[PDB]
Design a protein around this ligand. Structure first.
Ligand SMILES: COc1c(C)cc([C@@]2(c3cccc(-c4cncnc4)c3)N=C(C)C(N)=N2)cc1C
Length: 376
């Protein structure tokens, strides 16, 4: 269960998350589980569903323990419900350990599972504060750290086209180039961070930095898009439209309602600007930036029927729940969730995005003297 054996342990489909293989129960039942830094439950499909290839069968596990507690999770566009219990859990291409963990056996759901995603459950990697029904339900990673000698850290190397790596208990130096820059975890609930500055093709958006973090900024592998608060989304779209003015796209493209297509191999990457997110550093008024190319924010939509063309969805969207640095932001970066030191490291990954003109980057330090607190 070394780091080499953990390399390439993730798979996925574009816009459908990254998943890792796990086993639940005795004898082990193999399931594909979404790696989610934006939630804190280990929630697995435990009843038949038209989108599930397989599911957790509690009756077949001798080690299953029922907690006699239901869990009901409604949200805007859907819901999931289930029963809480505990069982033996392993990650075959992860640490060489078996732990007893809480499991939310999903019995009913609406618009939760995805057709052809190839995953059957979600591994919520965030803190107990956001666990459902409440903070007393110990998340998986907490159980793993308590029961084993595994260091309190994990890292994610999400690669586009999908695949990548989840390294538990350490940093795999073969997965990144250059320096690892750290941003403090503001509060241990979601992986909450602070954005101090936003530039679009080197041009500062010129907003009070609190606007970037209205009402929180999080690092979420379970969200596809870069999600931005209304004011920031509007200014970003205006700036991207201006840089890409040689071509006009429908309003629906800017809203995520429609694809933009070009003849295969002709995508005009150069008309689209680079987006720079400046993250709060580990020392006062110091920051570093992560640079996002259009190869990350224009997500390819694979469709045999549109295959004479290369088609893309605009992977930046409006949020009313704060900034979300989703999968398109994480892609090409090696992201260290250093729980032990309450910080998140970013470095250029071995699968980073680039063309012959520009590259995705992690650069610093940047100083500011006229800075307030950028948090809410
Ligand atoms: C606590 O209950 C939840 C909720 C409310 C949301 C998510 C989910 C979620 C749920 C179902 C599918 C996905 C999903 C879909 N497409 C791509 N990646 C992930 C995400 N939604 C977000 C924003 C997230 N980070 N995880 C997971 C769980 C377990």
């Amino acid at each position: 269960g070394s780091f080499v054996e953990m390399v390439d342990n993730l798979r996925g489909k574009s816009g459908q998350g990254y998943y890792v293989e796990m086993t639940v129960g005795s004898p082990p039942q193999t399931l594909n589980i979404l790696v989610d830094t934006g939630s804190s439950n280990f929630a697995v499909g435990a009843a038949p569903h038209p989108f599930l290839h397989r599911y957790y069968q509690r009756q077949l596990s001798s080690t299953y323990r029922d907690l006699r507690k239901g869990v009901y999770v409604p949200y805007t566009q859907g819901k999931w419900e289930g029963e809480l219990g505990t069982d033996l859990v392993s990650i075959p291409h992860g640490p060489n350990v078996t732990v007893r963990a809480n499991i939310a056996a999903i019995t009913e759901s609406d618009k939760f599972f995805i057709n052809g995603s190839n995953w059957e459950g979600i591994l919520g990697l965030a803190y107990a504060e956001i666990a459902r029904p409440d903070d007393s339900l110990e998340p998986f990673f907490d159980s793993l750290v308590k029961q084993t000698h595994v260091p309190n850290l994990f890292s994610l190397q999400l690669c586009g086209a999908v695949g990548g790596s989840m390294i538990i208990g350490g940093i795999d130096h073969s997965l990144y180039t250059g320096s690892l820059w750290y941003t403090p975890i503001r509060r241990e609930w979601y992986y909450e961070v602070i954005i101090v500055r936003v530039e679009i093709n080197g041009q500062d958006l010129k907003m009070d930095c609190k606007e970037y973090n209205y009402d929180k900024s999080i690092v979420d592998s379970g969200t596809t898009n870069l999600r931005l608060p209304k004011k920031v989304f509007e200014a970003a779209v205006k700036s991207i439209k201006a840089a890409s003015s040689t071509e006009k796209f429908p309003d629906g493209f800017w809203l995520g309602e429609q694809l933009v297509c070009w003849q295969a191999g002709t995508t005009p990457w150069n008309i689209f600007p680079v987006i720079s997110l400046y993250l709060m550093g580990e020392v006062t008024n110091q920051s570093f930036r992560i640079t996002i190319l259009p190869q990350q924010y224009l997500r390819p939509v694979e469709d045999v029927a549109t295959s004479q063309d290369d088609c893309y969805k605009f992977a930046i969207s409006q949020s009313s729940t704060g900034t979300v640095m989703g999968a398109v932001i994480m892609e090409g970066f090696y992201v260290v969730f250093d729980r032990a030191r309450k910080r998140i490291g970013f470095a250029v990954s071995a699968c980073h995005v680039h063309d012959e003109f520009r590259t995705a980057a992690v650069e610093g330090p940047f100083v500011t003297l006229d800075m307030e607190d950028c948090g809410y």
